[PDB]
């Protein structure tokens, strides 16, 4: 059993990845 706060961290990070990378994986990395 996992705390609600912890589940929220993981769900929001999952969403952030899609929000900040979905349309942008063709961008160059600033640091490579």
């Amino acid at each position: 059993q996992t705390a609600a706060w912890r589940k929220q961290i993981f769900q929001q990070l999952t969403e952030r990845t899609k929000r900040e990378l979905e349309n942008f994986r063709h961008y160059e990395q600033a640091v490579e």
């Binding site: 993981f10 990070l13 990395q29």
Partner: protein, 258 residues
Amino acid sequence: DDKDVLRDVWFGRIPTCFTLYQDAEPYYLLLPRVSYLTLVTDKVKKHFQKVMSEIWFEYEGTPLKWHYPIGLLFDLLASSSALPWNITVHFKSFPEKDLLHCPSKDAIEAHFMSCMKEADALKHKSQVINEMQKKDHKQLWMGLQNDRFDQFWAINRKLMEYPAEENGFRYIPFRIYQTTTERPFIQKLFRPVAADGQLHTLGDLLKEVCPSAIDPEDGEKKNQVMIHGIEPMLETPLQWLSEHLSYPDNFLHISIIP
């Protein structure tokens, strides 16, 4: 699971469009949330110097403070606007009153190490950072500069430990930013444990140091509280946030957005 959080935080990205100030094609990069504008924009400088601190960046007329981590600048200033983040690049008329000069990456290293040392002073009275060999300080810096998660955390792990008989750090390194970057941030001494040994939460921290963020009628968020582009519940333990959601500089930088 918790190690996965460290990785996700480390690899956060802000897709960004750099446009040269009028007085050249726009240039697009994924910027690391955890790093600094003046450390990760060599390609931008290269790209634009082909048509002509000295380079400086601006968002909607306001000079961007490079010493604030990229993800913090974005969350505070631009998170309500569509991506990519639109930054204007300047090469003339440096804002001498508004921005620290950044004459070399050494200046960035000095700022970063300065932040890490303040964080460890808060967490351990400097015991951890001072007992490290000098090359460990260098490894922390190079880990950030070269975007090497493994290299950084092999050392940073030590800064996240605490004594056996304790339940957290002495004080939590945090800064709370409101509305703009020119407004002084909030920073206070705040212990992660209560007088009875209970872990303090994010809600407890805000109730004490930024109560305007809390609805007095029900104790719930009144404003948007953002850390690394996400919104942790108020009941999230502060010690856990410090261990896992700090930036590489060991600080919890927190944005409050109305």
